[PDB]
């Protein structure tokens, strides 16, 4: 409970840092307290369904599926950061399933789309996902916290690929 609190505090500091500067890059040294924790995934990923993201896409050699996952995660990170930009992109309100970059990266994994819903892309058109007309701007806290979790998971997978994750054997539990 105490370790869990320290984690949440660390999570909030990083999410706030993303709200001030959406282009802010985090070093592995910065992410260390979020990486070194022995807390379960459910207590560390509050918005992202990390276990389902990993487990439902673990098909074949890790060296391939972890790489595919990273690729989806890196693009999902860019979607989040763009929503935090002091100047939001024109057409931030919707993402098309048939976007070349979206199809080849995010739609390559199971649950890729659900992550856009966490950002606020809750409305479903057969062409893609949109914000509701009633939402005029993105909830910045929700967005920052999802973006951070997306970046954290990508960071975790990257160390697994390199075999340098602090809890590497305990994470191959799956």
């Amino acid at each position: 409970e105490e370790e869990e609190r320290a984690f949440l505090v660390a999570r909030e500091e990083l999410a706030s840092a993303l709200r001030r500067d959406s282009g802010q890059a985090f070093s592995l040294e910065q992410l260390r307290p979020l990486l070194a924790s022995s807390l379960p995934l459910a207590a560390r990923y509050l918005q992202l369904d990390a276990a389902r993201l990993v487990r439902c896409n673990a098909h074949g050699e890790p060296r391939n599926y972890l790489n595919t996952l990273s690729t989806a995660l890196n693009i999902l990170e860019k979607y989040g950061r763009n929503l935090l930009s002091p100047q939001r992109p024109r057409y931030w309100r919707g993402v098309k399933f048939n976007n070349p970059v979206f199809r080849s990266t995010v739609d390559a994994v199971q649950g890729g789309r659900d992550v856009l819903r966490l950002y606020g892309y809750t409305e479903e058109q057969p062409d893609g996902l949109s914000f509701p007309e009633g939402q005029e701007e993105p909830d910045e806290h929700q967005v920052a916290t999802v973006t951070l979790e997306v970046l954290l998971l990508r960071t975790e997978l990257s160390l697994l690929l390199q075999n340098t994750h602090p809890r590497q054997q305990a994470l191959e539990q799956l």
């Binding site: 693009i75 763009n82 992109p89 024109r90 993402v95 098309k96 976007n99 970059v101 979206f102």
Partner: peptide
């Protein structure tokens, strides 16, 4: 681009 991500929104096309």
């Amino acid at each position: 681009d991500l929104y096309g």
